[PDB]
């Protein structure tokens, strides 16, 4: 997080704001609400309060404007800069201007007003752009349907004003660090030539032609997948990547979620309802044999026959000696199976069923 230069802050703990004008994009109420709710995310973690005066002068004037508008920071039409706000202070101080040339929505569609507002209001209270990709205060519009402060935004805002008086004390999601032992995984897939590891609402993109690991919100490519995936595997044959979350899964074709998902795992694959979820999964190079690990047992699905294989509720501790009792993630690359559990990665050899090399989970990165 970054505190604006000059450390601008408000002296008065009880602030007032006002929605000067409105956008013809959303019913005045949906906007009042969107802004009401946004102001709450910040007041929820600080001693600050935000009252809305319907007329007169408010500490924060919120307005919707186009291109040039007597303020030094003209808008660029559709796209790009969605809005701006000014650091705390008198007059124009602490104001927010939303680029009207934008299509403001109260849904998933491009440019959800609420999500863009929570950011702006960050600048309005004294915060500047954070270098942490998972922060709300990161100069980039992403949106997975939910909008919350990241632990980073909470730290930064409380650095300026202090904590909420609430007795429990709110907390936000933390961002993963590629090169940090103890790092663990939720799922690992091989989407088109590269390998993507998942951790929370983030992915770590590893591509052979490039040297660096890329960290980012899974929503960059797939806004409508569920937050916190459980397993994922690519199926070359049908250029598909299936993601799992509990009792159902999502099929993604490159960058587009296919029509019809999520879809339950019991009907589509044939698991007993005793299996409430999949822990990890990987599919054979070309033999069309997808393996789904469920606790200490595993199942094998025949992708072509679109049905499980003969009596497969088999124990992992048998057909896969060593690896362990539990699997967090798994993926196949170069005829080898790389099992992940906790912080350790096993280089299992299917050919001779032997654990060739124990290693760091984050080993696959540049550390």
């Amino acid at each position: 997080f970054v505190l604006t230069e000059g450390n601008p802050r408000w002296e008065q703990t009880h602030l007032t704001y006002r929605i000067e004008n409105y956008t013809p994009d959303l019913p005045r109420a949906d906007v009042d609400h969107a802004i009401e709710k946004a102001f709450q995310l910040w007041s929820n973690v600080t001693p600050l309060t935000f009252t809305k005066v319907s007329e007169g002068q408010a500490d924060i004037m919120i307005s919707f404007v186009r291109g040039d508008h007597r303020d030094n920071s003209p808008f660029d039409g559709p796209g790009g800069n969605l809005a701006h706000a000014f650091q705390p202070g008198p007059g124009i101080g602490g104001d927010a201007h939303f680029d009207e040339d934008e299509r403001w929505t109260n849904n998933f569609r491009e440019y959800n007003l609420h999500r863009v507002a929570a950011h702006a209001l960050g600048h309005s209270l004294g915060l500047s752009h954070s270098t942490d990709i998972g922060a709300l205060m990161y100069p980039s519009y992403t949106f997975s349907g939910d909008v919350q402060l990241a632990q980073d935004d909470i730290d930064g805002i409380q650095a300026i004003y202090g904590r909420s008086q609430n007795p429990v004390q709110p907390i936000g999601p933390q961002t993963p660090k590629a090169c940090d032992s103890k790092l663990t995984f939720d799922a690992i897939t091989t989407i088109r030539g590269e390998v993507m590891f998942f951790k929370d609402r983030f992915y770590m993109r590893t591509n052979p032609f490039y040297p660096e690991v890329e960290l980012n919100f899974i929503s960059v490519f797939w806004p409508q997948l569920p937050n916190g995936l459980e397993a994922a595997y690519e199926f070359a044959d049908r250029d598909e990547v299936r993601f799992f979350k509990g009792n159902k899964y999502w099929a993604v074709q490159g960058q587009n979620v296919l029509h019809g998902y999520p879809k339950d795992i019991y009907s589509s694959f044939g698991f007993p309802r005793t299996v409430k979820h999949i822990d990890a999964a990987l599919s054979e190079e070309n033999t069309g044999k997808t393996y789904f690990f469920v606790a200490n047992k595993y199942w094998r699905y025949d992708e072509y026959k679109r049905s499980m294989d003969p009596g497969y509720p088999k124990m992992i501790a048998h057909d896969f000696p060593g690896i362990g009792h539990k699997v967090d993630a798994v993926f196949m690359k170069d005829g080898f199976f790389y099992f992940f559990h906790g912080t350790r990665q096993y280089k299992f050899d299917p050919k001779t069923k032997r654990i060739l090399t124990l290693q760091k989970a984050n080993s696959w990165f540049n550390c």
Binding site: P139, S140, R192, E214, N216, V220, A236, G254
Partner: protein
Amino acid sequence: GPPGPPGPPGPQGLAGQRGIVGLPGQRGERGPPGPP
């Protein structure tokens, strides 16, 4: 003493950062059949 005037404008704002590299394209269909 009478209050002075306003200072100039803050320097230009930084350019926005580039975007995320697109995902790889779809693998090509399989080659044609074999010559009997």
